[PDB]
Design a protein around this ligand. Structure first.
Ligand code: MG
Lengths: 7, 848
């Protein structure tokens, strides 16, 4: 939920 | 009776502050302070870079960073507030770089979350009662979700100070309205009263000095003036002093923002440009404009003209249609695969659900809605202005929340302030306040039966809220050991180490545009990867990433823009080298996440549409109740009652892409990229290695199919390490007719690093009767994992030409164990290639 692409 | 007369509201503040310290510092302590101080997410790592740079050149900081987005460079929209605050904090505690500096920054967001109790108390104390202020101040200390997760130790991002100063501004401004209203006989100033709108301007100032788009608070306050004026026939307020505290607050804030207002040539709503300086100065003029409309309305300007007090709002309608009528005079969900943004109150498949509102606010969302609803009718009858103004801010934060996930931290204060109202009402009418009054003092006429339900309501609003925040705060959320150990290795074993460390700290000029490749003061090279790891590669490995979390360096394939999406989704090496050379890359860093769950985002980014990325994936594994492995290309070939592994096995197009040729094939089948580093296996397969050896097939395949099924019984998919084995197993079956690189089905390292190499161009003549030449060499990685490199070239004009990337005396820990076994028909040789021919691309002759 932290500017990471949807894991 | 002796201490709890004034210190009752202050002890519970200390209690609320102590629960905040437990959730934000104590819960995630063993996850932040591990092998290294683990700054979570991706943003707090770039702040680590800017603060480390600002301490270098103190008291002044950069505004353009050519160290990221390697070919051109990116501007910095990260506010100077947190950059300076973390820089002053880093120098007082004598921590200027490394883990020392990060350890100090870990406390910045946690402290901000604890201090956030004050403005929450302040804001709702001035619109409502001190009782509800105590509740809201307590409620904001345990509200979970994105407000909590970004207030956690080791997450120094601007989001906590974003809602901090945003609520601090509304409180100080409304406080400036209360200390000023009725006071107009020059007492409006008195060299004391001035400090209430002044401190409101410093809050708005520090709000914009921490977030670029912080100027959005100005239309919100201007909306207060708008509705306070147009509703003269329904709401009462001191429109004169309300306009004074507005023009003073806006002018002071604009005076504080003016220093940093020229760090971006041209207007921009995010970057620190003179645009935000015009909004704050302009809002002051509109505020002073409202002042003279009210001064005219005092003399009956709209009554001596024949208009009527029913028609005074039209004067505002006119003026607020001119300034907004003369201001101009002087949808693609594919590019938004990020987790921060997506339609709130809506499923990722598109369906209304409140599970988002529960997971980010607990019970405070539903107690807040009941609070907003009562505050609407409480204003609809009392006609109090600051209750209406607070509603406007509540609606504003709900509009922003309704569309974008990211703004869940802006609504935590909305829910906490309004759940406190809903709680303060049920505590007054259920005699819980009388009970707290009389069980300590003199007895009143109450009912213990109503008091019991009053605590039962409090539990329904506090237990689910805390039980979520308690569990959501037991982790950091940064780079794992496999990524940190892989990036610190790059800082040490890649060339130009000291040159990058020196340019990492230099103050960079502010260019007029970054369309041009930057003029680098030395021999630079680029490290390409997915943009999620751009801030990690820069702040840890101290290299230059083409793709960064600034939404830059991605490129695409539908327009042939060189980037990370066009590179990793390239289908051949020819198009791969194109984007590679255009961006001056040198190293690639692919992990197990790019190979599996993150490839769909890369496929969409390069295609610029979702249905175009559907061609990269195929069917699913089903397991019939009869216990048989199966692959159904569609969803109607699936046998009935058969359990489905919730993993989208890719199609044949993915298996011949760049990301697959890198991490899935361990660099085999390539001619210009050799593996130089491989991190340890994923954590789930490292614990599986204690009982199962990873080199034999049908043994690792057995334990992999067991983990997939025993987890597919629930609605979850197999782990990332298990996702790799299924991708390798489906390769030996769906790509069986081809098998360009027959790979062992086995897990690999979590993070791998390759090097773009010219290659030993080996050519020669062949026996003119065979049409291909194959080369092979067993290669050993730094994890002692063995694999076989392969490459096959055609025979043209009776000659051949191979480009071998790997070398036999490399300084990198990944190098072959056996010489190159070349073969053409039946003649074979045993040749060894050393680094002098590999790096320089030397020409070698060898007939067969
Ligand atoms: Mg951010």
């Amino acid at each position: 939920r932290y500017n990471v692409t949807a894991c | 009776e002796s201490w709890f007369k004034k210190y009752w509201h202050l002890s519970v503040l200390v209690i609320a502050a102590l629960i905040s310290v437990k959730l934000r510092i104590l819960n995630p302590w063993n996850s932040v302070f591990t092998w290294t101080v683990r700054l979570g997410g991706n943003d707090p790592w770039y702040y680590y870079r800017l603060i480390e740079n600002t301490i270098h050149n103190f008291p002044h900081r950069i505004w353009f960073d050519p160290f990221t987005y390697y070919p051109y460079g990116s501007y910095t929209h990260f506010g100077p507030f947190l950059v300076y605050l973390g820089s002053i904090a880093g120098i007082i505690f004598s921590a200027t770089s490394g883990e020392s500096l990060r350890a100090v920054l870990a406390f910045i967001p946690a402290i901000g979350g604890v201090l956030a109790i004050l403005p929450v108390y302040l804001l709702t104390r001035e619109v409502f009662d001190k009782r509800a202020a105590v509740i809201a101040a307590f409620l904001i200390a345990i509200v979970p979700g994105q407000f909590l997760q970004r207030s956690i130790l080791g997450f120094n991002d601007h989001h906590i100070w974003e809602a901090f100063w945003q609520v601090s501004a509304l409180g100080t401004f409304l406080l400036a309205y209360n200390r000023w209203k009725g006071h107009d006989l020059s007492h409006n100033l008195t060299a004391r009263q001035m400090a209430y709108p002044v401190i409101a301007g410093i809050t708005i100032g520090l709000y914009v000095l921490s977030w670029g788009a912080g100027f959005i608070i100005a239309p919100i306050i201007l909306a207060f003036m708008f509705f306070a004026f147009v509703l003269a026939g329904f709401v009462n307020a001191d429109r004169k002093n309300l306009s004074l505290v507005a023009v003073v607050t806006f002018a002071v804030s604009a005076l504080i923002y003016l220093p940093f207002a020229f760090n971006y040539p041209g207007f921009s709503t995010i970057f620190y440009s003179p645009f935000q300086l015009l909004v704050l100065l302009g809002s002051a003029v509109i505020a002073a404009a409202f002042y003279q409309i009210e001064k005219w309305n005092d003399v009956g300007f709209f009554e001596r003209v024949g208009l009527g007090r029913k028609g005074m709002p039209l004067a505002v309608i006119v003026l607020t249609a001119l300034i907004m009528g003369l201001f101009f005079v002087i949808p693609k969900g594919g590019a938004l695969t990020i987790a921060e943004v997506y339609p709130f109150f809506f499923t990722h498949n598109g369906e209304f659900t409140l599970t988002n509102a529960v997971l980010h606010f607990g019970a405070l969302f539903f107690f807040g809605m009941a609070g907003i609803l009562y505050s609407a009718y409480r204003f609809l009858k009392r006609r109090s202005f600051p209750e209406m103004a607070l509603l406007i801010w509540a609606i504003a934060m709900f509009i922003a929340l309704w569309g974008q996930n990211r703004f869940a931290y802006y609504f935590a204060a909305v829910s906490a302030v309004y759940s406190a109202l809903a709680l303060s009402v049920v505590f007054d009418k259920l005699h819980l306040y009388r009970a707290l009054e009389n069980a300590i003092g003199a007895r009143n006429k109450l009912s213990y039966f109503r008091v019991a339900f009053a605590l039962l309501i409090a539990l329904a609003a506090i237990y689910p809220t805390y039980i979520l925040a308690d569990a959501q705060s037991s982790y950091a959320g940064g780079p794992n050991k496999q990524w940190y150990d892989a990036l610190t290795w790059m800082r040490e074993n890649t060339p130009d180490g000291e040159k990058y460390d020196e340019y990492y700290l230099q103050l960079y000029p502010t260019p007029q545009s970054n369309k041009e490749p930057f003029s680098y003061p030395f021999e630079t090279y680029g490290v390409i990867s997915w943009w999620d790891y751009g801030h990690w590669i820069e702040a840890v490995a101290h290299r230059m990433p083409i793709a960064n979390p600034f939404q830059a360096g991605i490129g695409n394939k539908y327009n042939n823009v060189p980037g990370a999406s066009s590179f990793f989704t390239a289908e051949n090496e020819s198009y791969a080298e194109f984007v590679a050379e255009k961006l001056n890359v040198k190293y690639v860093v692919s992990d197990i996440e790019m190979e599996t769950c993150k490839y769909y985002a890369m496929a969409v980014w390069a295609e610029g549409d979702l249905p175009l990325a559907e061609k990269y994936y195929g069917g699913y594994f089903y397991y019939s109740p009869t216990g048989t492995f199966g692959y159904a290309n569609s969803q109607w070939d699936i046998p009935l009652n058969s359990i489905i592994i919730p993993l989208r096995i890719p199609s044949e197009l993915y298996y011949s892409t760049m990301e697959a040729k890198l991490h899935l094939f361990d660099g085999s089948g390539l001619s210009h990229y050799r593996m130089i580093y491989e991190s340890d296996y994923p954590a789930e397969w490292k614990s599986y290695s204690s009982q199962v050896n990873l080199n034999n097939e049908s043994q690792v395949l057995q334990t992999a199919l067991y983990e997939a099924v025993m987890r597919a019984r629930y609605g979850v998919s197999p782990t990332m390490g298990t996702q790799e084995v299924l991708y390798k197993y489906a390769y030996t079956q769906l790509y069986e007719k081809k098998m360009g690189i027959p790979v062992k089905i086995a897990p690999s390292g979590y993070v791998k690093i390759f090097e773009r190499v010219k290659g030993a161009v080996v050519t020669g003549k062949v026996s003119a009767n065979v049409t291909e030449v194959s080369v092979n060499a067993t290669i050993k990685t730094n994890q002692n994992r063995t694999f076989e490199y392969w490459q096959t070239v055609e025979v043209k004009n009776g000659t051949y030409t191979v480009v071998l990337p790997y070398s036999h005396n490399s300084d990198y820990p990944v190098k072959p164990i056996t010489p190159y076994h070349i073969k053409a028909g039946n003649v074979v040789k045993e040749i060894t290639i050393y680094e002098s021919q590999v790096q320089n691309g030397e020409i070698i002759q060898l007939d067969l």
